[PDB]
């Protein structure tokens, strides 16, 4: 059989739901090669794995080929771009002929932007003789012995749009940035020949690596292995001997080796939108039980009974507006909305779409909307709605899709009642708003319990006895209160010559009181305009 | 053996920390060629030295090859750009085949922008046949006998972004402009065959050459050697004989020869962002002991106990805002903030980002933020925040990275309390500001002592007896007072026919009192709004 060093299904732990989607796409054509000759159903030829580079997209194709048992030729895009004019088309044709020779098989096109850009972009004519004959060999769809052309690209709007037409590249699956649990899985994978000691736990290590692709996670565990082996075998002065197995197994990576490898800069994945299914429940956001009661009607009630809600002749609401004071848990309530729906989270920000405004990147607005269309089920939180009217126009003209079966919930948060234009206020598009108020006693106490449970908590406080003077201290304001209280705890605790109730109670008798008291009536006139 | 005229490790003195980083990267692949065949760890193939030209990036690769004992091939980018179509790709392929022939070895690609630009930028199609096959021979990663491909470029956003993807060019180290201590080291290097006399001290020479690369420092010591040898050997009328080595050692470069060579123009490094580790202590900035107490909590307390501050579940604050009167040591307090943190200093200015605003160079804003990500540990002082809202948007959308392990401290200084927008003032991003006040009695006395110690000081003054009338005279204002007092010391001291207490005391009885007295309450109402 094949060697175990080849990649298997177990070796990938980035996005296993997308792995299941790829298996659901291509497993039946590949494991069952004759069934499509009997049925009159076209198999999906040409799925397209789009995502950031280094997400392991070659390993997906190699793993599904090696588990399935299909032959795996690889057309690297930069490999056939450097052959001379006419030789590159000839090599592409021989690659597809070799694919059709030992079929069933799968052939990969890594870095299709090197073959096909979105614009023509290249005023020489040998590029169009390369994307042409690739469009022709996309029409290997004769319901043959099955070949599936998996492809890779940096962005799905970076390829030529003639590829996205039907019959050429039909399915378009996002491999996606891995989540924190996927980071735990991939660090658990990347230890089998590294042979860590028991001190390294990798949980907080994976949690500290948010915003990075699987490639530089493999590079950071490799770098930690380099730091662990760099303390020895030259200091031991035994390079002259053979490479000793008991020395390597006696060596182990250490916790501060991982801290060292993380400490050097690894921004191989530039910062982008996030894909995550949160575990943050209703209770972790403080109070808001009437807001819970409305939002259960808004998202939990349609997904508990989609058949009964659709049977009553009305679609579910497209999304709620969060309207009220800024930073009062309204930003983190979308975690509970996604969690109790068991849906994914997208948290694209206001200044991000402002950068799309200033760079005229409304194509990126369309791309993140279609990204939300791809994620299923998911929620589309977006704060700072009053910051933008090109982006308001683009949001309104792209929200017209009616993917209520996708259960996308278009939730937006802003503080300005009517400075934001009433083009959103038209009924049927996005109008079932709610007034999120200032955090009250239960809200402040429960958000203090949640944000103080995650810290070392020597409380010794009745939280009503602490938060009674908070007339309108917001959740952002009270987490800043906890921030400066724990900073004074740092101030009195780290001073030494070489407990925490004191800092809560000096925050209780503190002289810094800053509450936006005048804005509750500013919300209340428009709330009474609702009446 | 190899000749001593070849470059060694001791020859380079520009950025020895980056030299240590390069050694940490490529020493174990090169000094230990067999160890990666047994371990399952990919060595970093293709580190990338980026910096201004003439920083010595060829000498780094030649030095690590010559000290390590690996073969050094050099693919000069302009050299293989001039061959005919298909011949250049053939030469690149034979160069990589020769690299794989006598491996372990290192190959260099100087001026990769001549090979690969950031845009496609060239509507001929032989350039993409040149950057392609370079991407293909980046995939010499078979964990072979190890070859590492060092690369050189002017700017890290000037190469093609397909090179920055993982597996092709992984490590991206800044070779960096040298500091003043590096200038001392490189002028100490450039004297071994020059044979200076004892009058030349080179310390003030190195201090006078801020803003210049190592190339024109070698050119200025060469020019000083030319000035020293240009007074003789034709004036002596002894060119006809053999070149006398005893006369050459009897010849010596002189102090005014260095002044002459510096006096002719050497702008080979155009003015850019600066990289420096200051030694300017807390005492060198006048007073501000309560601001010292806050800033010790802000930067010194996290770096004294990172484990205890992270163990309390709260990240360190991203950076304080200097809020108060302009030019009162707020520009130079970041020197102390970097100094007792033992961190690097970046002092990018407000009008510099205004030139990024007017030229729409937000890519340069991303590049200087990633430069701060590269520098470790460092601080990111940036004044004139009220000058800028595209750049405010870009700063906010790029400051969202959470490199608290890097100990980057996002400090900004401005005088306008609320004219600058509070989008930065949203909590958790950049909110723990402080009110830097006008310099008081201790502050003005200490800044006068520090700025007058560096001058020839015949003080004979009680500094309280001088600065009692300074109601609100700033540190910029009082250094201007010292400036005009020393200019009157010039006025009375150099007049002659062919001491300094008089000028301090006529500054004491001077008739120019210009203090912005009206703005202390303008700061004080917002400071009491903090309450
Ligand atoms: N989801 C994942 N599971 C396992 N390994 C991964 C994953 N993502 C990235 N990697 C690691 O990152 C590297 C990048 O994957 P590769 O497919 O070679 O590059 P690219 O994705 O750019 O084609 C691989 O060597 C792999 O070990
Ligand atoms: N850090 C340094 N140490 C020693 N010499 C240097 C340093 N930086 C620059 N130089 C001098 O400057 C010149 C520029 O170096 P070189 O690598 O030849 O040019 P480039 O960096 O443009 O490829 C060299 O001749 C070298 O002598």
UniProtKB/Swiss-Prot annotation, chains A, B:
Homohexamer. Forms a ring-shaped particle of 12.5 nm diameter, that displays 6-fold radial symmetry. Part of a ternary complex containing STX5A, NSFL1C and VCP. NSFL1C forms a homotrimer that binds to one end of a VCP homohexamer. The complex binds to membranes enriched in phosphatidylethanolamine-containing lipids and promotes Golgi membrane fusion. Binds to a heterodimer of NPLOC4 and UFD1, binding to this heterodimer inhibits Golgi-membrane fusion. Interaction with VCIP135 leads to dissociation of the complex via ATP hydrolysis by VCP. Its EC number is 3.6.4.6. Changing residue 111 to Q: Defect in ubiquitin-dependent protein degradation by the proteasome. It comes from Homo sapiens (Human). The modification N6,N6,N6-trimethyllysine is found at residue 121. Necessary for the fragmentation of Golgi stacks during mitosis and for their reassembly after mitosis. Involved in the formation of the transitional endoplasmic reticulum (tER). The transfer of membranes from the endoplasmic reticulum to the Golgi apparatus occurs via 50-70 nm transition vesicles which derive from part-rough, part-smooth transitional elements of the endoplasmic reticulum (tER). Vesicle budding from the tER is an ATP-dependent process. The modification Phosphoserine is found at residues 268, 493. ATP 2 binds at residues 327-332. It comes from the Eukaryota. This is Transitional endoplasmic reticulum ATPase. ATP 1 binds at residues 53-59, 154, 190. GO terms for biological process: aggresome assembly; ATP metabolic process; autophagosome maturation; autophagy; cellular response to arsenite ion; cellular response to heat; cellular response to misfolded protein; cytoplasm protein quality control. Transmembrane segments: none annotated. It is linked to Inclusion body myopathy with early-onset Paget disease with or without frontotemporal dementia 1: An autosomal dominant disease characterized by disabling muscle weakness clinically resembling to limb girdle muscular dystrophy, osteolytic bone lesions consistent with Paget disease, and premature frontotemporal dementia. Clinical features show incomplete penetrance. Frontotemporal dementia and/or amyotrophic lateral sclerosis 6: A neurodegenerative disorder characterized by frontotemporal dementia and/or amyotrophic lateral sclerosis in affected individuals. There is high intrafamilial variation. Frontotemporal dementia (FTD) is characterized by frontal and temporal lobe atrophy associated with neuronal loss, gliosis, and dementia. Patients exhibit progressive changes in social, behavioral, and/or language function. The gene is VCP. It is found in: Cytoplasm, Cytosol; Endoplasmic reticulum; Nucleus; Cytoplasm, Stress granule. The PIM (PUB-interaction motif) motif mediates interaction with the PUB domain of RNF31.
